[PDB]
């Protein structure tokens, strides 16, 4: 029984390479670290969508393009004046995709052609629906996209109400391109799943977002920062961790089914969290991940992506709960990317088998006599 | 390479034993045939999330508790007035169901109890929504639940505008049986891989109907209409038949992942359309086509399955082609949340596989100026 689909290779890709020894990661053969540094997050979803960076013109199209593409229909932004303004972002995040699928007359087209404009559509898309959210929550309204921003400067600009600064952009654009891909992960996974079925793009990302929400996947991102207020100190981070680990519970921001080494998006992440810190957040961080990581390393479970991003989107103006959109808003060009790579290589229904543990020819007993 | 996870066994279950070989089904051991004769969709339910058979003061209770569920919360049914018309069934399902559990104060409490409790609610609100959709498709107002009906009868009842014969209630009834429950299927596994990563239910079932959505999954049931429509009488039905698998092309509602025999659901099915055929065409059709069909396709192992009779059921009982995968919904949303129910206790882990990969490895960053 291939518990958790643990092992399980199901599919062919060129997407992503995830070495969870070593700790390394590549979108389609390029080192995250390289991306990280030298690209912006119109660069990468283009590579990630297109299987190879683009060429000068290219990538200005591309980014006019996606850009074209930022604002959502009136009717959509109507319906989130009545969305619980309490409800949890990533459900907001689930309804707006949702409901953005039912404004498009061709919602049900799967043709590549058709994947990749709506795809263009969401990935340009997120940031506003993310962004709107967060107004709402701030009693404020949603801010239009500017065109003349990067997709990572403007996220901060529709989300803050003001132009973020070029390294305030530059952050957020780091933060974007480390979370927008990472293989057959839960909330790819399920959206391949969806998709396997041939349903649409939009049914395949609600299913991804519905996913990507949980705590033991993108959900740890807010995990770890309720973790770091739970603590509070970093007097009180070393004795936390003991107790935690001694009611046999789990750090939120370690582990990885794949990574059984540091996760080199959370290297890089650390580098950042250092940063915004020269710092509370990041010094207690700094004693759970030595502190659990005495006990927890030598079982090949390390910090992953989401134990430094939160210092990241907090110092970006982030309250907790919208650590998950934000990555959700960087993930949707993987999650895009892959749909159009399960397409081309694969496209089977997914339906898997259990190891049946049940009973059979059970009588069905008259109602009276039971 | 596991395509398609075929023969992939990843968890355990006790809910539903799929018999491939002689084709058979059991919910909690007991045969589908028994459940779709003497059980209801009440019963079914409290069996598919209780693992066992009510007692008489359960199922009573059982009943009562969903009975008074149905009704959709006044802001969902105002929601519902902007949802576009010309939406597709299953994307206003897809949205009803997120925008529910944005209205959930504890929508991600994913305790056992929290999971049986949030799951009545969606078990009993998924005919009220489905029924909503159509009304509002015509340009109608949804219906309000009645109590005093089955959730069959009450579905029907929402759905169609006037209260249901016993007869065709009885239909409704056993037709959400027989698509209550099917192992891991793609909704039913989409679920899983939803909520295996601990998010709430809405999300896992949202996830859960956008597999549904599909048309490779609870799909065929409207490409057998268009089968049986496109042959027009049974008189041409056995030469559209040769035809058609000489053009090399597939038969609707034959044919399975798992069932390499008769679909039992079908066989339950295939009794219900007769009953409903005593327009007899659409069967007569059907029996020329399973029978033509199948002397070709039964020893390839490929025959009727749940698809190829339960259109001619749902369209007599008024729904047209694109109501039926949510029907379906209305049904399997009951198996969704028993899965999720059992997934948690008994496995419970986060379903993360990889892929084989056959791409590119260290490749440089190219300077922009030198692509
Ligand atoms: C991501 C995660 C689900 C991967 O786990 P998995 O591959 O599915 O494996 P399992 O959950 O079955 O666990 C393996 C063992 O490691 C332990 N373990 C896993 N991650 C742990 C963590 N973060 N804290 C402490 N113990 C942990 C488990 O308790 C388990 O114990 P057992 O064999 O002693 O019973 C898991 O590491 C986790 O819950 N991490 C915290 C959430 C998180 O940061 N998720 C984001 C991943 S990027
Ligand atoms: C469900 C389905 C996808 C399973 O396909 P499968 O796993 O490839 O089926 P088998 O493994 O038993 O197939 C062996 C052969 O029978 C053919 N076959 C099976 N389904 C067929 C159908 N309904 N009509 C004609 N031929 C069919 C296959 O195409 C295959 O091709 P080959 O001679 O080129 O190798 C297929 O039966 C189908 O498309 N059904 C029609 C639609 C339908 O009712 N399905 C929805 C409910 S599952």
């Given at each position: 029984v291939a518990r958790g689909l643990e092992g399980v290779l199901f599919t062919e890709s060129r997407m992503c390479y995830i070495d969870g020894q070593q700790g390394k990661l590549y979108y389609y053969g390029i080192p995250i670290q390289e991306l990280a540094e030298k690209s912006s997050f119109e660069e990468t979803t283009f590579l990630l969508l297109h299987?190879?960076?683009?060429?000068?013109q290219e990538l200005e199209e591309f980014s006019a393009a996606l850009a074209r593409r930022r604002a959502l229909p009136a009717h959509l932004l109507e319906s989130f004046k009545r969305y619980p303004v309490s409800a949890h972002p990533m459900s907001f995040l689930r309804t707006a995709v949702s409901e953005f699928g039912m404004l498009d007359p061709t919602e049900g087209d799967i043709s590549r052609e058709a994947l990749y404009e709506k795809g263009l559509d969401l990935i340009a898309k997120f940031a506003t629906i993310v962004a709107?959210?967060?107004?709402?929550?701030?009693?404020?309204?949603?801010?239009?996209?500017?065109?003349?921003?990067?997709?990572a400067a403007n996220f901060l600009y529709m989300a803050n109400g003001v132009e973020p600064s070029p390294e305030q952009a530059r952050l957020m654009d780091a933060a974007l391109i480390l979370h927008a891909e990472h293989g057959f992960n839960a909330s790819t996974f399920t959206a391949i799943a969806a998709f396997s079925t041939e349903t649409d793009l939009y049914s395949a990302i609600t299913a991804a977002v519905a996913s990507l929400k949980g705590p033991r996947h993108g959900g740890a991102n807010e995990a770890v920062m309720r973790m770091i207020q739970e603590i509070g100190t970093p007097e009180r981070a070393r004795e936390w961790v003991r107790e935690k680990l001694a009611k046999k519970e789990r750090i939120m921001g370690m582990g990885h089914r794949v990574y059984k080494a540091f996760d080199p998006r959370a290297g890089v992440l650390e580098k950042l969290a250092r940063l915004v810190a020269e710092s509370?957040?990041?010094q207690?961080?700094?004693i759970v991940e030595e502190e659990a990581g005495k006990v927890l390393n030598p079982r090949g479970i390390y910090p992953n992506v989401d134990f430094y991003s939160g210092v990241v989107y907090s110092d970006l103006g982030f309250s907790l709960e919208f650590f998950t959109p934000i990555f959700a808003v960087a993930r949707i060009s993987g999650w895009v990317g892959h749909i159009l790579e399960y397409q081309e290589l694969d496209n089977r229904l997914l339906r898997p088998g259990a190891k049946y543990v049940g009973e059979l020819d059970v009588p069905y007993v008259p109602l009276?006599?039971?």
């Open positions: 299987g190879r960076l683009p060429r000068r709107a959210n967060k107004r709402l929550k701030e009693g404020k309204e949603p801010i239009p996209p500017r065109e003349d921003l990067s997709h509370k957040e990041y207690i961080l700094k009276e006599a039971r």
